[PDB]
């Protein structure tokens, strides 16, 4: 009985039958006690490596990996509950089993134990542990390829599993820079062509970018964690790709991080090359849409004035009259074009005139074609229509206000539109 | 009917898009070992920039070969409504994707403070446990208890045998 247990608690001695505690009327049943029995040992003995139940968790975990147990998932929920606490002994659950050798034995069992412990775990080691985990992210790489896929979505989970650990790493005052250094390393691995590209858009890589960028924006809006001045951004070559790849979610957190990066920029001197290069990274993205100077710009995230000849010559483009600009503008970017369309009939409701556009892309000729196939009077050009699209896009109608708000932030010419 | 045709369309799309990708890679390889003098495995700083260029070329191809049959529909041939449907599904799924990311971040925070509060609770309970002492006619009383057990057992038995109408719990 529970009440009878309280009286003899100062004089109660515990024999060591571990799993009999763990393995699941006139007098109260035993089942109610065993829930308290686990907490009893946690309070009878202080958290240390010498605790028998803690060693039992390690031993039973190894049984599942080697398939010695009758069924692998019998003790997995029990291990999860016990290993939630004991930061000093939660690391050895991860540190011992984060090696890629255990992954080869069973990749499925490692996933369910990795995802349930990393968010809880706290940074302890000052050094030795970023590289060990970075090896693990490098371990999954050329391992899914060994499995057969360039990026099998065990990596997507493990990228996020260690990403929430970074949230614990950065929220805690100690080793806040350790999470950022790992964050730049993990993002640098995800930007490469082998894992992701425009043609083969397995954008788990880019979603780990923004989920990393969201933490960067959450840390920023205030200067608690400061990135290196020679580095300030994730990387000069790292997230200029994320602007070229027109993923709507990828452009949002990046521009939010660009605002976060800019919020650190004026503190640093303007004569720095990286400051100027990062400045070049905020204009060109804002140039890249709705400026009609992209083809005239000497730098497109590091790109000279070309691309206009060949594919356009293989099959002639039936458009003209600033045909380059609509290849660049936000209403002309194929992924961002329909987001403007979603804004367009929201703007149409705002303007109280409803009419369906011909296509999901908005440009010069299509708007003229949409005109020639019922709408507000006073505007007939695409320049002002894109303005009325962008200001409503600057309202919290879609999560991609971040692109519209960043465009109106720079430059001062675009500031008056907002 | 048309769904099988579309599936084969996307299969050959994957195949020829990827062959286009490695043709671009090996074709700039035909350039880059000749363009400067002999480089092939330099770091991902301009080969990174080469993939940024590749992405820009592909997206320009999209916005060029997209202002097309899409702009002037054939009203019966499905080349452009499929791409539209892909647009709406991606855009609609991304919103809930982002809010799921936010909810996950909030849950991670909540777990952090839960661990903190559990930590100070464990510290206080350890202090309380340390405050307590460590775990470790009597024979006549034991004999009396044994006698009571025997007497109650025998009374219960005999009352059941005789069919007594007032059999009760005896301690």
């Amino acid at each position: 009985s529970l009440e009878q247990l309280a009286q003899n608690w100062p004089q109660l001695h515990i024999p060591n039958d571990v799993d009999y505690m763990m393995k699941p009327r006139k007098v109260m049943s035993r089942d109610s006690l065993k829930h308290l029995y686990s907490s009893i040992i946690l309070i009878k003995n202080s958290r240390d490596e010498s605790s028998s139940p803690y060693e039992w968790c390690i031993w039973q975990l190894k049984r599942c990996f080697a398939h010695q147990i009758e069924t692998p998932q019998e003790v997995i929920p029990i291990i999860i509950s016990v290993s939630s606490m004991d930061n000093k002994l939660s690391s050895r659950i991860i540190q011992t089993f984060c090696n890629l050798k255990y992954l080869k034995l069973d990749e499925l069992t490692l996933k369910k134990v990795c995802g349930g412990i990393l968010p809880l775990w706290k940074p302890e080691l000052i050094s030795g542990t970023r590289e060990f985990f970075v090896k693990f992210m490098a371990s999954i790489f050329m391992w899914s390829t060994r499995d057969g896929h360039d990026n099998n979505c065990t990596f997507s989970e493990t990228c996020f599993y260690v990403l929430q650990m970074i949230t614990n790493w950065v929220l805690d005052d100690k080793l806040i820079a350790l999470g950022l250094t790992l964050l730049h390393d993990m993002q640098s691995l995800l930007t490469l062509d082998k894992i992701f590209n425009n043609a083969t858009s397995n954008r788990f890589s880019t979603m780990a970018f923004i989920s990393s960028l969201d933490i960067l924006t959450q840390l920023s809006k205030q200067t608690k964690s400061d990135y290196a001045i020679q580095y300030l951004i994730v990387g000069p070559d790292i997230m200029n790709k994320v602007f070229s790849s027109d993923d709507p979610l990828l452009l949002s957190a990046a521009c939010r991080y660009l605002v976060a990066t800019k919020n650190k920029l004026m503190q640093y001197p303007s004569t720095n090359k990286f400051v100027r290069m990062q400045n070049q990274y905020i204009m060109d993205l804002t140039n890249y849409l709705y400026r009609n100077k992209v083809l005239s710009s000497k730098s497109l995230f590091g790109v000279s004035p070309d691309f206009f000849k060949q594919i356009l010559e293989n099959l002639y483009i039936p458009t003209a009259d600033f045909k380059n600009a609509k290849f660049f503008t936000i209403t002309g970017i194929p992924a961002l074009s329909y987001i403007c369309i979603i804004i367009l009939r929201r703007l149409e409701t705002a303007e109280n005139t409803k009419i369906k556009f011909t296509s999901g892309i908005i440009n010069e000729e299509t708007f003229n074609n949409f005109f020639r196939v019922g709408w507000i009077k006073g505007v007939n050009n695409i320049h002002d229509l894109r303005v009325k699209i962008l200001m409503h896009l600057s309202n919290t109608a879609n999560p991609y206000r971040d692109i519209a708000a960043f465009l109106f932030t720079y430059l001062k010419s675009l500031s008056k539109y907002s | 009917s048309s769904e099988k045709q579309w599936e084969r369309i996307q299969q050959l799309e994957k195949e020829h898009v990827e062959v286009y990708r490695e043709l671009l890679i090996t074709l700039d390889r035909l350039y880059l070992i000749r363009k400067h003098n002999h480089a092939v495995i330099l770091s991902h700083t301009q080969q990174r920039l080469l993939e940024i260029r590749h992405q820009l070329q592909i997206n320009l191809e999209k916005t060029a070969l997209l202002i097309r049959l899409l702009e002037k529909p054939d009203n019966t041939n499905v080349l452009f409504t499929k791409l539209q449907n892909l647009l709406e599904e991606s855009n609609s799924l991304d919103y809930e994707l982002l809010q799921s990311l936010g909810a996950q971040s909030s849950l991670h925070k909540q777990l952090i403070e839960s661990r903190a509060e559990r930590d100070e609770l464990m510290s206080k309970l350890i202090e309380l446990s340390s405050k307590f002492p460590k775990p470790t006619t009597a024979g006549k009383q034991v004999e009396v208890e044994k006698e009571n057990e025997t007497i109650q057992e025998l009374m219960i038995a005999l009352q059941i045998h005789s069919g007594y109408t007032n059999i009760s719990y005896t301690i």
Partner: peptide
């Protein structure tokens, strides 16, 4: 920090 990024890039090159 950048050394780890370069190491990862080289590893991806080898893969």
């Amino acid at each position: 920090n950048d050394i780890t990024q370069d190491f990862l890039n080289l590893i991806s090159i080898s893969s």
